[PDB]
Amino acid sequence: MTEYKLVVVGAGGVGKSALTIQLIQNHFVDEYDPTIEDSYRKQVVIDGETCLLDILDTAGQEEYSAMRDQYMRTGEGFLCVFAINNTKSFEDIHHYREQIKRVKDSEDVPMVLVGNKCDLPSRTVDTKQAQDLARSYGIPFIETSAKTRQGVDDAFYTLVREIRKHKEKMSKDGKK
Amino acid sequence: GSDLGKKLLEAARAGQDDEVRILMANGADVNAEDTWGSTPLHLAAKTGHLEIVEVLLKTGADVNASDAVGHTPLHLAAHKGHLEIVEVLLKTGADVNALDLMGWTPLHLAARKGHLEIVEVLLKHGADVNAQDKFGKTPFDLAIDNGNEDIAEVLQKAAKLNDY
Numbered sequence: 001m002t003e004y005k006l007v008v009v010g011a012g013g014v015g016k017s018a019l020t021i022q023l024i025q026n027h028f029v030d031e032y033d034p035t036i037e038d039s040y041r042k043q044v045v046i047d048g049e050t051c052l053l054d055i056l057d058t059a060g061q062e063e064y065s066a067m068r069d070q071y072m073r074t075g076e077g078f079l080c081v082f083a084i085n086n087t088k089s090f091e092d093i094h095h096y097r098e099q100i101k102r103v104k105d106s107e108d109v110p111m112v113l114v115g116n117k118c119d120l121p122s123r124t125v126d127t128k129q130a131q132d133l134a135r136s137y138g139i140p141f142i143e144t145s146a147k148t149r150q151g152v153d154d155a156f157y158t159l160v161r162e163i164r165k166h167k168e169k170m171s172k173d174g175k176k
Numbered sequence: 177g178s179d180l181g182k183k184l185l186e187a188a189r190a191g192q193d194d195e196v197r198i199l200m201a202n203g204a205d206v207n208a209e210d211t212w213g214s215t216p217l218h219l220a221a222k223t224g225h226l227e228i229v230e231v232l233l234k235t236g237a238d239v240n241a242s243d244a245v246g247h248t249p250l251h252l253a254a255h256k257g258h259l260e261i262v263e264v265l266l267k268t269g270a271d272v273n274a275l276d277l278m279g280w281t282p283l284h285l286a287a288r289k290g291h292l293e294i295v296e297v298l299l300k301h302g303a304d305v306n307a308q309d310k311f312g313k314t315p316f317d318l319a320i321d322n323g324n325e326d327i328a329e330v331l332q333k334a335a336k337l338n339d340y
């Protein structure tokens with residue numbers, strides 16, 4: 001059983017908590033069920049491997065913090081979440097990614113770009129723009145709805161696969 | 177231990193009373209931590225396993241241990257609405273006004289979630305009605321924001337019976 005340490009980040013209100021709770025509890029949290037920053041564990045099979053996902057669901061924020069730095073150092077991979085009806089949240093992605101790279105001092109941190117709230121009747125962020133950004137970062141882009149559950153498993157599982165590739169690319173380094 | 181520590185964490189989260197007892201008898205580290213800083217007491221508290229909470233507290237668990245996002249067991253029990261766990265934590269030295277990374281105290285968490293009895297018990301143990309979170313909000317303010325009017329009145333009366 002391999003453990004994967006996953007962190008969910010992004011602007012306030014984009015659905016980080018809703019995405020996590022859907023994964024863990026198969027429950028959609030609406031406006032009336034207040035959430036906290038918290039950690040979760042899920043056992044799943046991914047590509048034949050039994051995995052333990054240790055997930056930290058963090059708040060959107062714009063603060064320097066020693067504790068937040070610490071969880072970024074500990075985390076192995078990051079879901080960087082925006083909402084497809086919030087242009088600002090999409091513009092903020094750059095800052096989340098930059099902060100993780102700075103704190104972990106690495107150009108190759110496992111990450112997935114997540115465009116959430118794809119159930120909504122409309123949108124303000126163009127899919128192609130998000131795809132272009134993910135491509136320029138060399139990372140997967142996944143569209144999700146915490147409400148319908150579309151893409152929820154995909155987002156977390158894809159992040160696991162990105163961690164696995166990173167670890168495998170490091171072991172090639174570590175002998176050669 | 178680390179082997180025994182990992183087993184203790186999983187037994188505590190899963191509510192396995194007998195397995196917790198046996199692990200502790202074998203010298204499992206009662207304050208073992210998982211990846212994101214949870215101790216067995218955190219995991220028992222947040223999943224509502226009262227008997228394990230009690231056993232842990234009696235066998236040396238740090239009642240004010242703080243996880244990766246600044247939650248103590250009391251925060252988590254207050255959030256999740258486990259009254260009896262809140263009570264035993266407070267009776268065994270829990271810091272009633274512990275602060276998470278959002279600036280929330282247990283009282284804020286109980287007030288947002290509408291747990292009336294837990295609000296009254298926290299108040300009894302000296303919870304701060306004037307504590308402000310990172311957004312400037314007091315528990316009263318959060319009770320209003322979440323449409324918890326009974327809790328707002330209780331909080332408002334507490335603030336007065338304290339002003340005098």
Ligand SMILES: Nc1nc2c(ncn2[C@@H]2O[C@H](COP(=O)(O)OP(=O)(O)NP(=O)(O)O)[C@@H](O)[C@H]2O)c(=O)[nH]1
Pocket residue numbers: 010011012013014015016017018019029030031032035058059060061116117118119120144145146147148
């Ligand atoms: N329609 C829809 N609403 C969603 C979806 N995901 C989240 N929401 C809603 O968006 C609001 C905020 O969601 P939440 O999960 O708390 O966001 P967050 O990113 O965790 N916020 P914070 O950074 O403060 O912790 C809630 O009212 C929630 O129900 C989604 O996929 N679809």
Ligand SMILES: [Mg+2]
Pocket residue numbers: 016017018035036037057058059
């Ligand atoms: Mg959240």
Ligand SMILES: [Mg+2]
Pocket residue numbers: 039040041053054055210211212
């Ligand atoms: Mg965890």
